Amino acid sequence: KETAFVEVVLFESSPSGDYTTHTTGLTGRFSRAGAMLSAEGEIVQMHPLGLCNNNDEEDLYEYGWVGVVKLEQPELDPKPCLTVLGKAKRAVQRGATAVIFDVSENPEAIDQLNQGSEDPLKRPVVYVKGADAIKLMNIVNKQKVARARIQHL
Amino acid sequence: KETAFVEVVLFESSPSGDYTTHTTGLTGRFSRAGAMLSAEGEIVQMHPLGLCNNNDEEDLYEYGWVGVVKLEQPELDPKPCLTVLGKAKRAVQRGATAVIFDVSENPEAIDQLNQGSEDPLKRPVVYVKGADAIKLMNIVNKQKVARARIQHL
């Protein structure tokens, strides 16, 4: 639906106490399964098979993380553990302040999500594609310790 | 100037992996020294004498914290280390994603801040008073580990 401006911040401390930052802006869109809210947190890269309640608890994630999930070619998962819409549920259920899906290689996700007017989540679910997704992932993949800032309207 | 809706979240983990939350909403206003942006982070209680470059570096704060400063009666600080407007600068300079001043006992702060159209900060500066400030502080003081969510418009 409405636009989801997203900033990604890489940050190093300097000896002089102060932080340095690089920062990259992405456009994204807000799903109807999520709340159309601003939100901000440390980015966590969730494995699409890593958001599975097949396993009870994975590791510790401190409350308030931005969960980023790079979606797979649907063809390559016939037998999943969780819906696109119930993966979001669990991350949120587990501290995520926002969820971000790179649906580049699975655009049907959009609909499943955007036809989610049955019990939507308190926290935002955002999807990205195109050149906007390329960046994110090139940042998440290559990076480690990065903070996302998702703004609404 | 414009309103700054602020949520304060207390959060505990449950054995079952999931978080529980209590949450309290405050109204605040956005200073002209800050950016009128949404922002979110772990709340840190900065001492008004604790935001002093009299001391070079204090302790480690991970980038992205919401700095909360409860302002003193001006009468009780004739000889300060930093302006209201340069205290904000340093927190921001040191990772703060937002700054929050309880100006209850020092409303002049407002002006000093709101007459800050000379080189304003990338990150938001919010002030609160009244029943809105009472809450925050009653939460910060009594609490430990709490997350703030500041929304614009």
Numbering used by the authors:
A (entry chain C), B (entry chain C): 53 to 205
What does the paper behind this entry write?
Rspo (R-spondin, also roof plate-specific spondin) proteins are evolutionarily conserved from fish to humans and have well-documented roles in a broad range of developmental and physiological processes resulting from enhancement of canonical and non-canonical Wnt signalling. ZNRF3/RNF43 specifically targets these Wnt receptors for ubiquitination and turnover, hence reducing Wnt signalling responses. Direct extracellular interaction with Rspo proteins inhibits ZNRF3/RNF43 activity. Here we report a molecular level analysis of the ZNRF3/RNF43 ectodomain structure and its interactions with Rspo proteins.
The ZNRF3ecto crystal structures revealed a distinctive variant of the protease-associated domain topology. Two β-sheets (comprising β2, β1, β7, β3 and β4, β5, β6 strands, respectively) splay apart, accommodating an α-helix (αC) at the open edge; two additional α-helices (αA and αB) pack against the β4, β5 and β6 face of this distorted β-sandwich. A disulphide bridge, conserved across species, links two structurally elaborate loops, β3–β4 and β4–αA. The crystal structures for apo xZNRF3ecto, zZNRF3ecto and mZNRF3ecto showed no major differences in the main chain conformation. Comparisons of ZNRF3ecto structures for proteins crystallized in several different crystal lattices, or for crystals containing multiple copies in the asymmetric unit, consistently highlighted an acidic region (N105-E114; residue numbering is for mouse sequences unless otherwise stated) within the β3–β4 loop, the short αC–β7 loop and the extended β1–β2 hairpin as flexible elements of the fold. Our crystallographic data provided independent structures for multiple copies of the ZNRF3 ectodomain in eight different crystal forms. All but two of these crystal structures reveal an extensive interface (average interface area 992±109 Å2) formed between two ZNRF3ecto polypeptide chains. This dimer is conserved, and pairwise structural superpositions yielded r.m.s.d. values of <1.3 Å (for 275 equivalent Cα pairs). The interaction is twofold symmetric; strands β3 and β7 of the ‘subunits’ abut face-to-face at the core of the dimer. The β1–β2 hairpin forms a second interface by reaching out to embrace helix αA and the β3–β4 loop in the opposing subunit.
